[PDB]
Amino acid sequence: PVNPEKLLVITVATAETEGYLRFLRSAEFFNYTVRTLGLGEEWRGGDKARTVGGGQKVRWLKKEMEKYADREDMIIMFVDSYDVILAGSPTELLKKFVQSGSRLLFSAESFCWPEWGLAEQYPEVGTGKRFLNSGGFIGFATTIHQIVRQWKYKDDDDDQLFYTRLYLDPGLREKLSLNLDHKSRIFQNLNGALDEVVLKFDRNRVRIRNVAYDTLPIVVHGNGPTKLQLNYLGNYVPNGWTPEGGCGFCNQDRQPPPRVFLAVFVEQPTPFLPRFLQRLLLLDYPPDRVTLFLHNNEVFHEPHIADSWPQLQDHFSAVKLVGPEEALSPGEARDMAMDLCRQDPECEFYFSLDADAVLTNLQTLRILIEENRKVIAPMLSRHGKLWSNFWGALSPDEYYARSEDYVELVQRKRVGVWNVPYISQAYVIRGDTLRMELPQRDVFSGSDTDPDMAFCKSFRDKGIFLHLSNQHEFGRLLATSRYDTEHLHPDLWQIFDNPVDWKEQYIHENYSRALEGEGIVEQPCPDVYWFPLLSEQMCDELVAEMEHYGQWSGGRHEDSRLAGGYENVPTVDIHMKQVGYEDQWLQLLRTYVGPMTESLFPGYHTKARAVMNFVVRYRPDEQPSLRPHHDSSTFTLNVALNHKGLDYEGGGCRFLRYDCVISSPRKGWALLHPGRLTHYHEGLPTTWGTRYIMVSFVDP
């Protein structure tokens, strides 16, 4: 039973990169003893991601092994550190080594790298990996010393060719009892084996299983082009995220805060921008510590920015606008904003936020800064859909791909802080990282590749992790896909594409409370109910849209009213059809009036059909009143669109059979009365100003 106190892990690492630190945490979880060679030095092993190299690893190890040249009592395992995580204990590792009968076991690989023509020389293996991989091997210290002694080559020569050449010596391979871990009992190299590796869960720990060989490896090596697959596994293995404990490295549970450069990007016509700009004033972070940069690409949004700009300038420490007349492409804009932060040593954190990100959590900035990562994004999704501001995986093209755990994360079945290949629309970046690790200006620009992808790739190429937190509800993403800008108030037409935001801007703030009892709804006259439905902004924009159409009814015009004997009872009005708002208004009816009606009239059901939908204008100079009549409806909805007193005098609705009068309508509130038989009614004369109302004859 070999003693774990005699096992030493040796690894190489010239800097404490996020991968190195991920490795160490996995080593410390199992209580391994880790010696790290090279930590302050310059890497001379060549660009291992483009070419061969790594001989410097062998030189440093050879020098370290001279201490242990005679230590037959010591087992040593050498592993890479930037792309390796440990998944099993020293005890299990040692038992498995001993079972191999080997004196120095190398990991095995599907590819014969870097000289593919050496494959013939290798021994035959039935089903396991055939070839040697230098990223991981374990053996007696005396045997390892005898191998690494023979290093006498350049720092930029290939370490794995060196070991392969020695392994392919039949006399040497037998003298020293050298072996390869063909069936991945100990070492799992991913390159060429992705289809064989799955996560194996436990209550408080995760590891990996090779389903081809039915093994539980100890060492997971994301060798070659599998770093992102290793990134994926390292979110779980060994104690990343677990069924019972959750995430293991996040906070879980949440005097001057760091100065922040906040950069906002308006790169396409985007709905509800006035609302977004107003949210900036509400972000819970001291505004004297925030510098605002706003890039607007859209002349459509210039009035919006202008209205908001005085309040922003008074709010934040400093503000800078870059408008459309500057002709910047989105890539150049984002380079410029990031570089303003990079070049200012007082910029401790850089926070990029696009205009289609709705931050519902006003503490997002604090939360992300406290997470203490180089780069981190809050998870934002489109309402009720899977689409989000991150990708879990990449295609070989390096385009979008759905990771095996994407849906669980978007649905927040698994919450934590995830290492992912792509983030967008909102993220926070350390100022130090921009200065020390990505000093180039051309981060988003440079190739014909999309800027958002180029940015992520820029960070991946430096080995910087991209973190994504779904630990909290942070907000959502607006649909901007087909946003029709040819209206006086385009956001009035957003009831389909952005219904959550549409409701919050146009439905009365006390509507939902009214629909749940609470004694808001009123019944001023028998079977006439009165409730808040439309927000003041909705009334104002709707009136303005009607006046902008300008073509009100006149003589010869006919409505669906019933008075006396086949009389015609018209109003000066505009029907929703004429302005192109029928479909939107029916959606309102379906969603907000239908349910209100069934609640106030128990027993009644409706799908809210209405062929007659129109806005009425009363004035002393044209048609000031509406004579007694019935409506061609099962029930009628009558919504006040302006203020009695401020905008008009007189007016109001009278119900003759009940000698009951609605003398003082409320802007945004609706009347709901039966349309036939019982509620013969009259619109009293408007005596001054202009009185606007919205009328729907539903279920005719």
Ligand X SMILES: O=c1ccn([C@@H]2O[C@H](COP(=O)(O)OP(=O)(O)O)[C@@H](O)[C@H]2O)c(=O)[nH]1
Ligand Y SMILES: *[C@@H]1O[C@H](CO)[C@@H](O[C@@H]2O[C@H](CO)[C@@H](O)[C@H](O)[C@H]2NC(C)=O)[C@H](O)[C@H]1NC(C)=O
Ligand Z SMILES: *[C@@H]1O[C@H](CO)[C@@H](O)[C@H](O)[C@H]1NC(C)=O
Q: What are phi and psi of 215, to 5 degrees?
A: -125, 165
Distance (Å, whole) CA 269 – CA 560: 40
Distances (CA, A) of 139 to 14, 69, 103: 24, 13, 5
**Binding range to Fe ion, per CB under 5 A, among 32-40, 314-322, 405-413, 572-580:** 572-580
Q: Is 559 in the site for Fe ion (CB under 5 A)?
A: yes
The site partner of 31 among ligand Y, ligand Z, its own copies, none (C-beta below 5 to 8 Å per kind) is ligand Z
Closest CA to 621 of 672, 528, 688, 566: 688
What is the smallest separation between the CB atom of 537 and ligand Y, expressed in angstroms? Answer: 11
Structure tokens at 249: 């490295």
Which neighbouring-strand residues pair with 683?
Answer: 626, 653
Q: Is 323 in the site for ligand X (CB under 6 A)?
A: no
Token pair 């030095």 in the structure block, residue: 41
Pattern 171-190, ligand X, x by CB under 6 A: --------------------
Distance (Å, whole) CA 177 – CA 188: 21
Q: What are phi and psi of 23, to 5 degrees?
A: -55, -50
Of 22, 57, 561, 681, the one binding ligand X (CB under 6 A) is 57
Which letter, b or e, does each residue of 58-95 get, where b requires 16 or more Cβ atoms within 10 Å of its Cβ?
bbbbbebbeebeebeebbbbbbbbbbbbbbbbbeebbe
Pick out residues in 94-153 that bind ligand X (CB under 6 A).
135
Nearer to its own copies, 476 or 630 (CB): 630
In a 3-state reduction of DSSP, which class is residue 137? strand
Q: Is 579 in the site for Fe ion (CB under 5 A)?
A: no
Mode of pairing for the β-strands spanning 260-266 and 290-296 = parallel
Distance (Å, whole) CA 337 – CA 329: 12
Q: Is 38 in the site for ligand X (CB under 6 A)?
A: yes
What is the smallest separation between the CB atom of 637 and its own copies, expressed in angstroms? Answer: 13
What is the smallest separation between the CB atom of 249 and ligand Z, expressed in angstroms? Answer: 16
In a 3-state reduction of DSSP, which class is residue 567? coil
Q: Is 561 in the site for ligand AKG (CB under 6 A)?
A: yes
What is the smallest separation between the CB atom of 509 and ligand Y, expressed in angstroms? Answer: 5
Nearest position to ligand Y, beta carbon: 510
Nearest position to ligand AKG, beta carbon: 683
The site partner of 13 among ligand AKG, Fe ion, ligand X, none (C-beta below 5 to 8 Å per kind) is ligand X
Site residue total, ligand Z (CB under 6 A)? 2
Q: Is 136 in the site for Mn ion (CB under 5 A)?
A: no
Of 674, 687, 688, 690, the one binding its own copies (CB under 8 A) is 674
What is the smallest separation between the CB atom of 665 and ligand Y, expressed in angstroms? Answer: 14
- Is 561 within any annotated ligand binding site? yes
Distance (Å, whole) CA 458 – CA 45: 22
Site residue total, Fe ion (CB under 5 A)? 4
- Is 643 within any annotated ligand binding site? no
The secondary element (H helix, E strand) that includes residue 370 is helix 364-370
Residue 108 in contact with residue 181, Cβ under 8 Å? yes
The site partner of 99 among its own copies, Fe ion, ligand Z, none (C-beta below 5 to 8 Å per kind) is none
Residues near 683 by beta carbon (within 8 Å), at least 6 away in sequence:
616, 618, 625, 626, 651, 652, 653, 654
Quote the DSSP letter at residue 644. B
Q: Is 83 in the site for Mn ion (CB under 5 A)?
A: yes
The site partner of 509 among ligand Y, Fe ion, its own copies, none (C-beta below 5 to 8 Å per kind) is ligand Y
Q: Is 185 in the site for ligand AKG (CB under 6 A)?
A: no
Q: Is 31 in the site for ligand Z (CB under 6 A)?
A: yes
- Is 618 within any annotated ligand binding site? yes
Residues near 107 by beta carbon (within 8 Å), at least 6 away in sequence:
132, 133, 134, 135, 136, 137, 180, 181, 186, 187, 188, 189, 219, 221
Closest CA to 488 of 540, 422, 555, 423: 540
The site partner of 437 among its own copies, Fe ion, ligand Z, none (C-beta below 5 to 8 Å per kind) is none
Structure tokens at 435: 């200065």
> How far is it between the farthest Cα atoms of the chain?
117
Residue 76 in contact with residue 94, Cβ under 8 Å? no
Pick out residues in 623-652 that bind ligand AKG (CB under 6 A).
626, 631, 636, 638
Of 653, 670, 672, 694, the one binding ligand AKG (CB under 6 A) is 653
What is the smallest separation between the CB atom of 336 and Fe ion, expressed in angstroms? Answer: 54
Distances (CA, A) of 378 to 284, 339, 384: 15, 22, 17
- Is 681 within any annotated ligand binding site? yes
The secondary element (H helix, E strand) that includes residue 332 is helix 330-342
Distance (Å, whole) CA 506 – CA 668: 10
Nearer to its own copies, 257 or 628 (CB): 628
Q: Summarize as ranges the residues that interact with Mn ion (CB under 5 A).
A: 80, 83, 135, 223
Binding site feature residues for Fe cation = 629, 631, 681
Q: Give the residue numbers of the binding site.
A: 12-14, 80-83, 221, 224-227, 561, 618, 629, 631, 638, 681, 691
Positions that interact with ligand AKG (CB under 6 A): 561, 616, 626, 631, 636, 638, 653, 681, 683, 693, 695
Annotated binding site for Mn(2+): 80, 83, 221
Binding site membership for 2-oxoglutarate: which residues?
A: 561, 618, 638, 691
Binding site for ligand X (CB under 6 A): 11-14, 38, 43, 48, 54, 57, 80-83, 135, 223-224
Give contact residues for ligand Z (rule: CB under 6 A): 30-31
